[PDB]
Design a protein around this ligand. Structure first.
Ligand SMILES: *[C@@H](C(=O)O)[C@H](O)C(=O)N[C@@H](CC(C)C)C(=O)NCCC(C)C
Length: 212
């Protein structure tokens, strides 16, 4: 795999979003990976619906948190609408998929990256954007405004984001806290520290969609 990957340069990443106060990070993370894999497979970059996952995933807890895995499983079982068709409201409502016409995209499955393994995560990122989790509760992560981040942070993961690239000493992460946080909404988290958890627990739980 190469030294640098950046799916933004391949036109596979949509603009940075703001989840607001709702604990919907799991849905934002899943949607980044869907937008990526649909571009890779079909050539078209579209925005897909975080709100639909928020409303419709009965394995997750709405604005009180959820699971990237079950969000990706839902898209593989049913499909997902365009963001425009089912836009983000920041509050859980009833599932409105059937009112809003046919789904716009569908995937075929979900796979996990081997956990606690930096090289396995880089390998998956070289193929597509990957849903990853990290510990975001610490003030250092909250206040991050640029540079290669090394913490302080622990491994008490609590926040789902999306890995859309990497370089020699970092992994490139799209966050859902608006463009005013980090590097235009992104963070470069240091890699290669020898900590099997990853910096801020970044290697704990990583998933990506499968689309034949
Ligand atoms: C993340 C956010 O900042 O919106 C959101 O709070 C969330 O979904 N957190 C989950 C943990 C991450 C590791 C994805 C979460 O709390 N999920 C609840 C399910 C388990 C019982 C922890």
């Amino acid at each position: 795999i190469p030294e640098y990957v950046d799916w933004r340069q391949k036109g596979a990443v949509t603009p940075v979003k703001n989840q607001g106060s709702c604990g919907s990070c799991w849905a934002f993370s899943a949607v980044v990976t869907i937008e990526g894999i649909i571009k890779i497979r079909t050539g078209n970059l579209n925005e897909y619906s975080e709100q639909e996952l928020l409303d419709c995933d009965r394995r997750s807890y709405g604005c009180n948190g959820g699971y990237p895995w079950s969000a990706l499983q839902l898209v593989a079982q049913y499909g997902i609408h365009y963001r425009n068709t089912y836009p983000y409201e920041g509050v859980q409502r009833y599932c409105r998929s059937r009112e809003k016409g046919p789904y716009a995209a569908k995937t075929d499955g979900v796979r996990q990256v081997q956990p606690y393994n930096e090289g396995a995560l880089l390998y998956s990122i070289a193929n597509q954007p990957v849903s990853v989790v990290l510990e975001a509760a610490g003030k250092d992560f909250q206040l991050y405004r640029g540079g290669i981040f090394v913490g302080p942070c622990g491994n008490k993961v609590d926040h789902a984001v999306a890995a859309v690239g990497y370089g020699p000493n970092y992994i490139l992460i799209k966050n859902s806290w608006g463009t005013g946080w980090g590097e235009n909404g992104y963070i470069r988290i240091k890699r290669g520290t020898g900590n099997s958890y990853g910096v801020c627990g970044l290697y704990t739980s990583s998933f990506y969609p499968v689309k034949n």
